Design a protein around this ligand. Structure first.
Ligand code: ATP
Ligand code: ADP
Ligand code: ADP
Ligand code: MG
Ligand code: MG
Lengths: 456, 506, 177, 51, 456, 68
């Protein structure tokens, strides 16, 4: 029937309906007059439902009539969504008029069953030395770009999009969750100017939007990717920051009447994360390959949110603030990054031995650093002096000029193949470049460009 | 070809009579907790029946309402819906029919291989056998790892914790311990709590690729499933493991993340508004893990003859547990890790610094301990593990002198290389479990000085080639050692002659 | 908290006084009138004004009821007002009858048949229900056209269902489980 | 592969069996309604008092 | 009279009683038809009482009848408790039938008054040389026991249990606070095999029992010890772990909803420790002496639990893994172990000087051993080499064959007097035994036995 | 708001008046804190006498009860 607003507190709104017409959990409601949508989150009792606004409440009042829609938020899906920018409710947020949808799906859904999961190890080349070496991605696998503030999550993702999405023959979904509106504009003009906007669906929910918008934007983008997967297609799903989904739940949790847990987080942190993460998967019909950027509060990887996220991913790439503070990009930690593909049966024994060889040298250098600081470098053995020189060369050979980062560096971008990466690191470990200075390996590309740089 | 008409014949033999039921009405629904009005005779732990074949459990029997948790999906339930007492506690199917099957926390098959044919059911929550019905742990449980089986031995009925940070081999060590039981006689149970569905499928695919699945029960409660199912899964798996122990047999159970079970129990508690403590956990989080882990035990012949009512005689049954816990940046002082470290019989600590230094099994033998010790070892491994302990201890004391090996005193330099060769021997590969005879060759060779002329970098190829040689020319001696892990002067002389002959030609 | 939790002390006080002075019917009438008056839209609004004192609100409720409240019930209304509990009168009235019913050894049963109302049917079920409950039964029959044939008997939390719709429910779950 | 094909066959048989039962129960509801009102209403009420 | 269950929340149960029959704080209540005991914690008012179930609450329901018993949890006391295993309520957990009790005492009482205290400090002669010399115990005192597993803790407890009963006509009580069921069965058989079981009463609160059981077991064991003290005896009270008594109090305090204190402990931390520790004293009739194992959280001695416990300890016995390797099976560390009774104003100048003399020589030898290792034995002076020889003789003379260890040592047990202990060490410090070999001073008991063992 | 200390089934205002300003009744007991009903003339910091020779100190003087 019809309901009346009874209590507005921030982004949370209570609506009272006849005790015989109480709307369902996750049901969408519409306010009369005002253009605002409310999703039922809890049934308090006595015909009252607790809901979160999908817009602003500055114009809302007590007593406004609310209408029950009989269903959850229904967004447009299929071919009509390609080359379009949309909000959480699926409305077009571009001036290109309406979208010719032929079907609408509900953002809430069950995860694929245990019998529907599919296993594949097809190696996906990225063109980045550190990743292709220690974090080899797989087609249909889940990748996570973990890092704090200002270390390269967006930049690295843009480079991957460029080295994969542009070549990818299938479709793609890009979801900007709690992102800067300036990054969304630069990326839209970039996809449009590159002529690739035709095969990319764009959903944006930036930081200027109400908590409810940032809490459901991820389900909207995923619902569009699930329609394409279920058609038997191969899809790419890029999420700008999945942390903003957890944070929107923390911002609203206390007003929903929930007691706080450790580090002031919602008591439903692990279930709210599992309900989203289990839908982003490759079933037996089609394959979703996904890259998610994961913000790390205060650079602490032990924080409950980052700590609960690792178990949901196949490839974990870790970006370090201490490496970025030395002017080294990509700022990937080769000792904290890992992949399920880093196995001799999947990548081969030569690649695996080269990756483990690089990690052994870097771990040994990490423990010799303090010795060198207090006593000095002459008090080391001849084997240690040689190992420290090679560790410093490997640490600089992992830096790479990127095409999406030329405005920040002024230097042209480079794409290194997996064959070239293995050869360059195997050579440094063996000793084929113990005469070149460590500065020759900083920001170059393949090992030949280090040889040319050394002369100059 | 035709089956629908015959299965319907049975449906016409089912009760159609009225039954007295005790009911209530749903008052509120939120975050997986349905509050009910009525149910005056519901018991603490009883299962409530809702419309649609959805079931719940009563946990907060307050004066004016019942707080119930859904054992499934709660987003279809609503205010005014009917709720009914069942008169029953939660029970799961039990027996040999579960071996080689994947099931949910309630015992329903999820693998798609068809219905389970279990001949009995049992209660998920039960008390552990009392003090007087137990027997001391003195039988081994081989894990196939030289570092664990030689220095941190696990016995039948013991509880050994696998503790360490993320991504360092915790799961690999427990899965390999299950794979090694395919020929031993120990039935195995693996419980997955809060894992993603594709990860559980890679472990089952590896249990099948190694021939271990037909001897294992897999209980799953994945990350998208209700916190009540994740909280109950360890108790359901324990109940399935207790069948074999109470009937005179032996079983092994792995709880892949007790820390995720604690997180699920914290969610339910804070949503029922129970008073919080340290790290926001409820006041009975110690009792949660202790009630579970004290069931893993060894029971005497008199308990098995009493339970079997005489059918099984002369046999002592057991349930061995390998709980797994994740630490944050090596902090073992956190609330949940502190509780479980104090409940268990021993701990295997895995370290990130050792794992990044190429020491793949990552077992820190300097802090890892088994309180059962030598009682959980065969005679041959108990005799060859004593010197391995002394050599690693000496290596931990003399590890800074490697950069000054020239300047060292000869005695100390002899000890240093022995320590470095025994340290390189502990390194092993995944999915490669070793038998008592094969482990004995490697431990014997190092402990009796047969590695002093092998470069620390060739110790591994020497081990691999030595085992391959004995598998061809000494198959009868390996079979003899594998009977009971026995040791005597003929076996000692036999192994020595084979190692001397190996070096003299291979 | 549940209105029942807040109203429990007041309802029990009324019952224990009423029982000890042989007034179990006078208080029943008084609590029922107070509940009704307080629920009226004009009285509801008057009782939620910041200008009126607790005594002024209490007095206004006694004047509207008049003769219907005996001296003791008038004192009880003042006590509820002093404690700021006048929004709980309907709940206090409900819980008072429940305590009284257990005392008189009676139950208000809610029978719902498939298209039938007959004295021959009611007295045939009421003896068996009275015997089973060990109490006097005040049947409150009604019509439930939803049912194919039969009756559902509700008494307290006990629900004896003998309807064909119940047999259809059982038949449906049996096939899919 | 052998096991996967054998369990696929029994899965199709049990899946259709569930739908076939649901349609048979739907017919039973209509069938019952005619005889249930005259004959069963007195028999049901009297039987419930005996139960 | 009887009441009714009104609310069940985990181990916390609320019961309603008639206004004239409300049970007292700490009173024990019985649920009709079920073997469940409730201890009353608080009187909420209006006839309702809050209690903690002393067992599982599975299968309980609202409306069940509950009976008041008129007193606190009452347990069997006296001679009949020796050689028996009991739970927190005094029930025989061993399958040996009912306890032949003649009397029952309530577990809650006040500590002995200011007027009931003994007139001085009297040492308890343990008959163990290293303890009686370096760690003197006072009658009515509390001893903290520190160390890991496999270092002789169980054998040391069995020897003390044997000596108090045979050499002093006393008895022992063992309180298994949070006992492991496997270790509880092993300890019961080890004491039966060592023939000490008929000299001790065993009270176990197993780890799988609710928080209320683990909190009250220490008071049950203490109530049995109080009875023997009143008989005219000196008694030993062994507490398996005092940290688990503190944790059980933290768990119960959280269940009752009390506001937590510093580091998350209960607000009643010092009072709960004082109520237990103040009953253990030397009265004018007998004396309860206690040996308590102590656990230190996160290796921090400033943590509220270690801090509070150390305030009630009179002695600290440390068992060393290093000393055990040397071959001294008692394994008590003479340098780390301490006692408040090691004062010349209490033990007299002679005992004090002999003990401090042994500690000085053993300190110097530990320093000289590093010199001998780094530079060599030839680098030391003649006086230092003479000290090393006396230190080694002292170190071996600290060993002793125990009657419960005859199975391990292959030699008969010894009970050395304090007089014989002082005389033996005083002679070795003065040099009266410098001609004898150090081995002659190993596993011998008194100093005359070293003389003969050297003669052969 | 939740139940307060005066809201009990036996605190029956049968007579709408007041008597005995120096005496009260214990309402609840918990961890060394007692709630008393009826001590109308008790001063802040005053000694309260209970049976069996026990004494309390008045700390909370509320509308409906005294905390000691
Ligand atoms: N010998 C080895 N023993 C253990 N792990 C090994 C070994 N050699 C290589 N690895 C690899 O190390 C990684 C360990 O992963 P595993 O899942 O077992 O760790 P984990 O600590 O349990 O991780 P997680 O926290 O995600 O559950 C895997 O990639 C595994 O294949
Ligand atoms: N690959 C790179 N090359 C050069 N500068 C980089 C690179 N990655 C990051 N930066 C620096 O940091 C910024 C990028 O940070 P960004 O990718 O937005 O980080 P995050 O998303 O983690 O906050 C750039 O403006 C530049 O100054
Ligand atoms: N006094 C002793 N004499 C000889 N051996 C001992 C003695 N005390 C300890 N040991 C040795 O140490 C082992 C462990 O001692 P125990 O008292 O059981 O320590 P814990 O209880 O911590 O396990 C014994 O089994 C024995 O081998
Ligand atoms: Mg960014
Ligand atoms: Mg794992």
């Amino acid at each position: 029937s019809s309901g009346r607003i009874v209590q507005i507190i921030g982004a949370v709104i209570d609506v009272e309906f006849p005790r015989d017409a109480v709307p369902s959990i996750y049901e969408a409601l519409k306010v009369q007059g005002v253009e605002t949508t409310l999703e039922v989150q809890q049934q308090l009792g006595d015909g009252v439902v607790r809901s979160i606004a999908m817009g602003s409440t500055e114009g809302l009042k007590r007593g406004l009539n609310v209408d029950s829609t009989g269903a959850a938020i229904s967004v447009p899906v299929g071919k009509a969504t390609l080359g379009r920018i949309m909000d959480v409710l699926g409305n077009p947020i571009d001036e290109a008029g309406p979208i010719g949808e032929e079907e609408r799906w509900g953002i809430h859904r069950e995860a694929p069953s245990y019998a529907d999961q599919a296993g594949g190890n097809e190696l996906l080349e990225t063109g980045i030395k550190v990743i292709d070496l220690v974090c080899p991605f797989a087609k249909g696998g889940k990748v996570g770009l973990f890092g704090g503030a200002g270390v390269g999550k967006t930049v690295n993702m843009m480079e991957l999009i460029r080295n994969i999405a542009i070549e990818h023959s299938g479709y793609s979904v890009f979801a900007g969750v709690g992102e800067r509106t300036r990054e969304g504009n630069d990326f839209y003009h970039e996809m449009k100017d590159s002529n690739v906007l035709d095969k990319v669906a764009l959903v944006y929910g930036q930081m200027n939007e109400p908590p409810g918008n940032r809490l459901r934007v991820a389900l909207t983008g995923l619902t569009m990717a699930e329609k394409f997967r279920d058609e038997g297609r191969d899809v790419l799903l890029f999420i700008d920051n999945i942390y903003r989904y957890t944070l929107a739940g923390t911002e609203v949790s206390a007003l929903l009447g929930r007691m706080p847990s450790a580090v002031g987080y919602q008591p439903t942190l692990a279930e709210e994360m599992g309900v989203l993460q289990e839908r982003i998967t490759s079933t037996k019909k089609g394959s979703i390959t996904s890259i998610q950027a994961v913000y790390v509060p205060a650079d602490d990887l032990t924080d409950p949110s980052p700590a609960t996220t690792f178990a949901h991913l196949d490839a974990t790439v870790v970006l370090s603030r201490d490496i970025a503070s030395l002017g080294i990009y990509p700022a990937v930690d080769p000792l904290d990054s890992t992949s399920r593909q880093l196995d001799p049966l999947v990548i081969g024994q030569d690649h695996y031995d080269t990756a483990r060889g690089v990690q052994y040298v870097l771990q040994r250098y990490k423990e010799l650093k303090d010795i060198i600081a207090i006593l000095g470098m002459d008090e080391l053995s001849e084997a240690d002096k040689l190992l420290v020189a090679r560790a410093r060369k490997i640490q600089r050979f992992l830096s790479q000029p990127f095409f999406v980062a030329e405005v920040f560096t002024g230097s042209p971008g480079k794409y290194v193949s997996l064959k070239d990466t293995i050869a360059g690191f195997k050579g440094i470990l063996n000793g084929d470049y113990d005469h070149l200075p460590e500065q020759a390996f900083y920001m170059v590309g393949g090992i030949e460009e280090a040889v040319e740089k050394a002369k100059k | 070809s035709e089956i629908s008409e015959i299965i319907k014949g049975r449906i016409e033999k089912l009760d159609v009579a009225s039954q007295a039921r005790n009911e209530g009405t749903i008052v509120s629904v939120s975050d997986g907790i349905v509050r009910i009005y009525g149910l005056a005779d519901v018991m603490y732990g009883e299962m409530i029946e809702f419309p649609g074949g959805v079931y719940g459990m009563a946990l907060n029997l307050e004066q004016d309402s019942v707080g119930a948790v859904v054992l499934g999906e709660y987003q279809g339930l609503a205010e005014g819906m009917n709720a009914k007492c069942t008169g029953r506690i939660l029970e799961v199917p039990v027996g040999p029919e579960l071996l080689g099957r994947v099931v949910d926390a309630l015992g329903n098959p999820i693998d798609g291989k068809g219905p389970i044919d279990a001949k009995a059911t049992d209660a998920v929550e039960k008390v552990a056998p009392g003090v007087i019905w137990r027997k001391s742990v003195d039988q081994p449980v081989q894990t196939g790892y030289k570092s664990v089986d030689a220095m941190i031995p696990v016995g039948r009925g013991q509880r050994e914790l696998i503790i360490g940070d993320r991504q360092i081999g915790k799961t690999a060590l427990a899965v390999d311990a299950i794979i090694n039981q395919k020929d031993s006689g120990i039935k195995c149970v693996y419980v997955a709590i809060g894992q993603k569905q594709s990860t559980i499928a890679n472990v089952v695919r590896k249990l099948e690729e190694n021939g271990a699945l037909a001897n294992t029960i897999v209980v799953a409660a994945s990350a998208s499933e209700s916190a009540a199912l994740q909280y109950l899964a360890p108790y359901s798996g324990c109940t399935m493991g207790e069948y074999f122990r109470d009937r005179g047999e032996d079983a092994l159970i792995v709880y892949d993340d007790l820390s995720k079970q604690a997180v699920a129990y914290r969610q339910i508690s804070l949503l029922l508004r129970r008073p919080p403590g340290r790290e926001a956990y409820p006041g009975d989080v110690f009792y949660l893990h202790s009630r579970l882990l004290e069931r893993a035990s060894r029971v005497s012949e008199e308990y098995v003859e009493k339970f079997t009512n005489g059918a099984v005689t002369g046999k002592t049954g057991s349930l061995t547990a390998l709980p797994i816990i994740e630490t944050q940046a090596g902090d073992v002082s956190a609330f949940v890790p502190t509780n479980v470290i104090s409940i268990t019989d021993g701990q295997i600590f895995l370290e990130s610094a050792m794992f990044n230094s190429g020491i793949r099994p990552a077992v820190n033998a300097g802090i890892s301990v088994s309180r059962v010790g030598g009682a959980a070892q065969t005679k041959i491994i108990k005799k060859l593990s004593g010197g391995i302990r002394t050599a690693l201890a000496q290596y931990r004391e003399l590890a800074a002198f490697a950069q000054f090996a020239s300047d060292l005193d000869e005695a100390t330099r002899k000890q240093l290389e022995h320590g470095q060769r025994v340290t390189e021997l502990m390194k092993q590969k995944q999915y490669a479990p070793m038998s008592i005879a094969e482990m004995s060759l490697s431990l014997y060779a190092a402990e009796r000085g047969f590695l002093q002329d092998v470069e620390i970098a060739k110790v591994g190829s020497f081990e691999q080639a030595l085992i391959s040689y004995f598998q061809r020319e000494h198959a009868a001696l390996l079979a003899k050692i594998n009977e009971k892990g026995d040791f005597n002067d003929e076996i000692d002389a036999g192994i020595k002659a084979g190692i001397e002959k190996f070096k003299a030609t291979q | 908290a549940e209105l029942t939790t807040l109203a429990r002390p007041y309802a029990k006080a009324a019952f224990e006084y009423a029982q000890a002075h042989q007034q179990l019917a006078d208080w029943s009438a008084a609590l029922g009138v107070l509940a009704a008056v307080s629920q009226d839209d004009t009285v509801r609004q008057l009782l939620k004004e910041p200008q009126l004192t607790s005594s002024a609100k209490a007095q206004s409720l006694i004047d509207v009821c008049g003769d219907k409240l005996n001296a003791p019930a008038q004192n009880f209304v003042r006590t509820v007002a002093e404690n700021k509990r006048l929004e709980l009168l309907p709940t206090i009235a409900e819980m008072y009858e429940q305590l009284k019913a257990e005392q008189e050894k009676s139950v208000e049963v809610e029978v719902t048949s498939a298209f039938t109302l007959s004295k021959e049917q009611q007295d045939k079920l009421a003896k068996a229900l009275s015997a089973r409950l060990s109490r006097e039964v005040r049947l409150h029959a009604s019509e439930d056209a939803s049912l194919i044939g039969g009756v559902i008997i509700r008494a307290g939390d006990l629900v004896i269902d003998g309807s064909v719709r119940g047999k259809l429910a059982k038949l449906a779950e049996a096939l899919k489980s | 592969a052998q096991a996967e094909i054998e369990q696929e066959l029994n899965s199709v048989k049990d899946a259709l069996r569930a739908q076939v039962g649901a349609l048979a129960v739907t017919g039973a509801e209509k069938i019952l309604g005619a005889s249930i009102d005259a004959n069963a209403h007195e028999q049901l009420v009297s039987k419930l008092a005996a139960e």
